[PDB]
Amino acid sequence: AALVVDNGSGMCKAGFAGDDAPRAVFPSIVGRPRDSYVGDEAQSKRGILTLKYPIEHGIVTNWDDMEKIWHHTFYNELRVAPEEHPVLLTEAPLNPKANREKMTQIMFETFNTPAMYVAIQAVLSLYASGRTTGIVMDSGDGVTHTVPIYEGYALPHAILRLDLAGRDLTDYLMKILTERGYSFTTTAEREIVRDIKEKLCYVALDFEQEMATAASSSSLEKSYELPDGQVITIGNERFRCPEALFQPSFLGMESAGIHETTFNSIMKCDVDIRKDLYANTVLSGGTTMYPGIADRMQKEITALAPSTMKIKIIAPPERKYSVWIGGSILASLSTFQQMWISKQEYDESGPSIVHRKCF
Amino acid sequence: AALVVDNGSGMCKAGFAGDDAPRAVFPSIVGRPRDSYVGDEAQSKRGILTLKYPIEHGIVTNWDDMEKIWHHTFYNELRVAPEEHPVLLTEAPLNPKANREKMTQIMFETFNTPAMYVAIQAVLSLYASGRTTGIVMDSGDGVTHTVPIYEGYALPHAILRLDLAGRDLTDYLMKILTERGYSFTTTAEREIVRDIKEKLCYVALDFEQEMATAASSSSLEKSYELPDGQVITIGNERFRCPEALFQPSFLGMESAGIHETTFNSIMKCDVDIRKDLYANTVLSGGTTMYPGIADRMQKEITALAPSTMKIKIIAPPERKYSVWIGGSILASLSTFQQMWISKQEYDESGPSIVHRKCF
Amino acid sequence: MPYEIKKVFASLPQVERGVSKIIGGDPKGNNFLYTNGKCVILRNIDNPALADIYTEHAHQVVVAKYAPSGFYIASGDVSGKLRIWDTTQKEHLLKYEYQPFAGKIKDIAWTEDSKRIAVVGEGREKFGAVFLWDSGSSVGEITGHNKVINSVDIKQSRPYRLATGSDDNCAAFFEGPPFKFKFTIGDHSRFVNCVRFSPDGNRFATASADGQIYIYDGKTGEKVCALGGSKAHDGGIYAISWSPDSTHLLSASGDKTSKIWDVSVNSVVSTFPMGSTVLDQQLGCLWQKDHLLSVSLSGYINYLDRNNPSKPLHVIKGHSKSIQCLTVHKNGGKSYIYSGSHDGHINYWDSETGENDSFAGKGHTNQVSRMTVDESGQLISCSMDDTVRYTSLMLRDYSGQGVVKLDVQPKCVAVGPGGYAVVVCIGQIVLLKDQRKCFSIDNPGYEPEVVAVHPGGDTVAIGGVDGNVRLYSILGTTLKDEGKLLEAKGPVTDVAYSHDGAFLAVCDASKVVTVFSVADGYSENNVFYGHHAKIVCLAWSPDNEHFASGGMDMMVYVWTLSDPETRVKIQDAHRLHHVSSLAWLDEHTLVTTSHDASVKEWTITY
Amino acid sequence: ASGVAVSDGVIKVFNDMKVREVKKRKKAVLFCLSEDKKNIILEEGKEILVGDDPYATFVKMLPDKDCRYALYDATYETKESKKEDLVFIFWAPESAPLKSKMIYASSKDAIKKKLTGIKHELQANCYEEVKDRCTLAEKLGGSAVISLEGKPL
Amino acid sequence: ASGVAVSDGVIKVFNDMKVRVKKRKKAVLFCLSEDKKNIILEEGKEILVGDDPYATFVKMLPDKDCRYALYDATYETKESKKEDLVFIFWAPESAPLKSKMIYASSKDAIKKKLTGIKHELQANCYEEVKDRCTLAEKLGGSAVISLEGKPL
Amino acid sequence: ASGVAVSDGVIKVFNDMKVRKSSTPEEVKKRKKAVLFCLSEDKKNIILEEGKEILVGDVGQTVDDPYATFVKMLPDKDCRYALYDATYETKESKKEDLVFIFWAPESAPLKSKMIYASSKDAIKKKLTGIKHELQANCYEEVKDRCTLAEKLGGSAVISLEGKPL
Ligand SMILES: Nc1ncnc2c1ncn2[C@@H]1O[C@H](COP(=O)(O)OP(=O)(O)O)[C@@H](O)[C@H]1O
Ligand SMILES: Nc1ncnc2c1ncn2[C@@H]1O[C@H](COP(=O)(O)OP(=O)(O)O)[C@@H](O)[C@H]1O
Ligand SMILES: [Mg+2]
């Protein structure tokens, strides 16, 4: 059996090839005292330690913490020995070649994995959507990537990277929940606010009309039960928190919204392929799971795009783990056994074999 | 005293005739709220406004914004009344005649300048280099132009335009600095990255050899201090950023490099004059100020040139402002006083007078 | 003739780990050829010292192949550009030029009649193209491959057949001309690296990265056998070469050994173990006449010895990386040329016989900036790893020699009598006496670039970016500034005293060579014009009357000191590459090296 | 890349179709994964002969819940000239299972590249996208195309 | 263009030299006026036909300033012996920027005034003017065997 | 926003100082290099200080260092507005720019500091076209000549008022 590991910006998802869903989904953090706690242990260890993200926006910056995260993934989460199972890894778009070779070397030397493979998250999501040409809007925990792919080739000159993702939405929800009188400052309260965001937040098709309706009635209010039994009420903050995706000025950021970033990335491509990109906009990532996000994205892009063009936004129900699921399919195929990078090939061609076998 | 204004794609340089250096050099941007901030004022407000380039590739696109930029130049930068000083302007190569007429109309009607003159930037650089026949590679902020000039007459059929310029180099450095963990996203940080590019970047004579030697080179590593006191460290990215000039594939572009564009422009001329163009290649513009760009350009052009041909890349020390300085001398000459388009000549002849006096 | 090429010390093939290297052989069996950077090297197989270099590609040449008639060679670069050029004349005039596809070219094959060329690689919209040599019109279509094609071969006997091996673990078989797809063989499980038809055409063998070699019939494409039974090699085979009699096969693999197989009986005839390190992996092989060549990962070319498999007959060494420094030394009755490249490798070549070798042991790890020889028969080399190494020139062994560590990266080094060395670092001047640091001139008020020591060991001339040469005196263990400022026309790039110490020659970036006469108060003696680009190297002839300067104009000028108006013009001594360094073997021989990793000698006649 | 191997019959069929007896030439053909899902084989009973509206009877041949590859010899009449060109059609309906969609999408390049010379690709993800003649005309020649399959657009 | 007007002396000299002995001039130097408004003839910067002329003409050119020059080049080929006028624009790199700009921007006026000239030499450093290969190439395309008598 | 209006004299002086119109050499010496604005006795308008100004003609003949004397004119117990025509020189250009200085020492009374800080935005907005602003709250912050250089261009400024740093 092969292992499929998706290294997200804030959440790492590991599982076995052929499974419908990843077995372990845990935060991609490393905590050190203000010895070293990785994953859910760091969250459940009080605020006596500082948290660091080896992957903060898709690109690995601290490899020493990444080795710890992968060790925790293999031994504590998956509970398997990496030396006996081939591992399929996913890399963010526009990943430097040096990071790819370092990942291959770490897998083949530190963990002694018998076989290894690297895939791009955006192309995996596009393939899982049943498409080869289109634009993938992968909005994760710490980074949002708009990747236009034409016939299976991502266009590096038009891939756009946005620092707006679910982490900033959770922080904004924490900030705006204090207006009602609810104090959420600790990490334990941060997880509660994250759960509230995942369970009660939705994207409004028209922000101003929804705000007026919320201010003129109480039909939008919802009740959430805290772990200690207290019940809190939330109103307009249900749609104000995800609205920062389309209006980043709510968080004081310069960059445009996800719809405008998608439009800019589409307009940076050739004119002949813009029509195909407009009609094949695929959403992926945990952040794109807000109800009503597809309709709002379609409306905003249609406003931005020329009238004659046709806008179609793809929101598959499995898009939250579409990066992993497709990989779990790809590594489960009987014909993929020959596509693995064997350890014999590694200690015959160096880390550069990843550029020839994969990519 | 006459005024000399050089309108670039990214920076506008204004000063007085007879001066060694331009008095004001400010970004050629116009900002409007997300009432109207022009130039550096737009840079100091950042996210509250959207920035736009009226001149984005040497050619004027938004005349309304260029009017405000010229007003800012005359009143806020030069701090003089335009109606009392003759103004010498510079126009990009392959500038449409309609743009020339619009410019000479705006100067005489909107600002009531007593006199006006238009000159080609490439011919001004070539004259400032002490030459009348040769090919000028004017690499600016947002555009690069290869202009072959024979006997003071630019050849319109052989002028080549490449969209690769200093703006793309700044964006490339901005992108590759995130691989080290540094977060550069905002407009204000873009100027910091531009300063890093201007101060610490250099062109390597041999790119693969430079990579091979720089792995263990103790002098490659450099440190830069941010305005807020933070210190960033830059290594091989010093020579990777300008390498995109000769290898556009680093940006994902399919276009040719500056050396190949220069060779293509040379090959588009008559065989009789190709020798002079090869022997009189003149570098100009801010982008061509990287240390070691002349040697690299010579080495790359020699490969494409025939076996028996003399390649001489001219890199005068003042090539950064050679367009302006060449103008500043030209307007300061007493004998030039008869070459000014007087307002009376404009009234008798109309906007077409520039087609005769300024050629 | 003012100048004549005498000897060419060819560069080693440019090899990359895990990538097969293709070595071509002529039908006449005289020169075998390979590629390095922008150069195509034709090395004489019988005498590797004799060689020729063709440098006309604007990109990195991947593969070159002789035509079956032996008159033309087709070479392709990474840009998809293919050049067919004549070989009978030393000019190598270009005959035809094509761009079959916009992508890397991997292999080239010719037909028996030598009028059709098949070029394979990885294009934007196609993976191969076979076309007439004189018109470029397609005479077939190469289809059936969805990945890069690494090799191609064409049957040399009627009926014509074509075989391609690619990275989709499959080999396509076509019949023609016109070449049409016949079928795809998918026996291999990894990248198919080399596919070669036998010289008689009766059989063809495909080798892959899975350690298996498959022999198929040359006419029908049906499988005949598998070499070695279960497997042929313990690692990926990168190249194979059929014997001229077409019954034996020579295979080179990544498991650090080569093998000779008897194809007809499926038995291994010979096994040559090449080593036990990563650099000993074999990436290319060739069987021409009785010569068996195997190219290691380090670039060395081993002549395999059938009688003694453990020890090859010859190990042709050299530089596979750009040579940065060059010097000469007369040891005993023979002159050696020592060249240092940017990988830290220092190689010595015999001036007359051309035999070359390398210092034993482990030495420099980065670019060797400069090298020189003192009076005690020691090579002093300053390199980019902040080290100055004193290596004894008679033991030729790196272990047990002198190493001096500098806190700043050195850029130039010069030596003089009395065990005195002056090392210029980045913004610092350091003096070494008896392999010990004893004086530093840190913060000298300028940026030193080059250093020269007077033959008397008393005066040191140091150049700077400002264009001024400053004079120092080595008194005791210190340098005293003499307050003398010789003026040049631009940033000084090299300074060199005369062998007798009567003249100091300074070259700058202003394309001017200024010679000052030491005898009369270091006053200017002459100025030499003629360079049209930045001057990079300068050397003094032993007769103390001529001196040779090489520049970035790809030009070398031999100047006569007495008459500045008379000069010897060596135009394009190394094509497309400026001369990195040069020296003088005697009063009539000039040795020049460049970034093409090649060393050349020129006989100069005045 | 899933790693499936394209059968030689597909390449031979494409080679015959690309060049231009008439009653036996193929106007459309369907490709599909084998039962063991390791070969892109030809569908035996799903093809259209030239001698035998062809686009309508080609579209209805596509399954409603499975992905397929197709090669349609689309003919059209532009203003300046009349031309016939092959189109590679990737039919991936949204109602298809996730595994089939992923395997067909990841292995599309393995068959597309083996058929060198193809220049038009139509990715149909729904029945409306494949029944629509205007998008096929735009893919073929854009605004230059005025009539497709012998009928006005 | 700078608009500097060329004096009638220059055009008279060019015209009488063009029409084809000791009084005749082989080469002549043109300089800029002190007022910087006219192209004038420098006093002691002429070579008489009756009086190697090219080497002396090269030494005659200033090192730190720009000049114009008219040279009656004499090149002999295998077919015949041809004498033709050439215009030389001496603009050394060491010259001040003002002089280089003024001389370059006011070259089209003087050259167009001297109608009937074909060969133009543009020397920006001593190496471009001291040698004879480029001048011979300008005079004749792959046909010049020697120039001014001295063999090439 | 204290609502204090800017008197027409201050606006006229700023307009004359910003734009340099062609004039006789005797009229150039009448230009203002540094000027000081204060509050009216009724604290309703921003009037111009009578004797607290420096002329361009006085620079070089009587005033050796314009900046030192300008700092000397600043009161040590009261808040003022100042307009200084700084002529500096960087590595690439020689610039002449207006600097708005808000002098507010800690020893000044609280009322004056509050009124001057609250009304600074209105007068700054009315003085359109000024980019540099120097906020000085102590004598050490404005006496030195390096603070003005840092505010103007930063470390790129190599000369100030015709003298090296
Ligand atoms: N149902 C949901 N609705 C809204 N947001 C969600 C939902 N599920 C997860 N998220 C958010 O998605 C973020 C990360 O999802 P994911 O795409 O896995 O990130 P990454 O791509 O970095 O692994 C989390 O911060 C979480 O808050
Ligand atoms: N010293 C330098 N080194 C490298 N690049 C520079 C330097 N100075 C300026 N530049 C670049 O030159 C660009 C603009 O120069 P310029 O030629 O004035 O552009 P334009 O003429 O189009 O306005 C800027 O984007 C800047 O990045
Ligand atoms: Mg993700």
Ligand SMILES: [Mg+2]
């Ligand atoms: Mg410009």
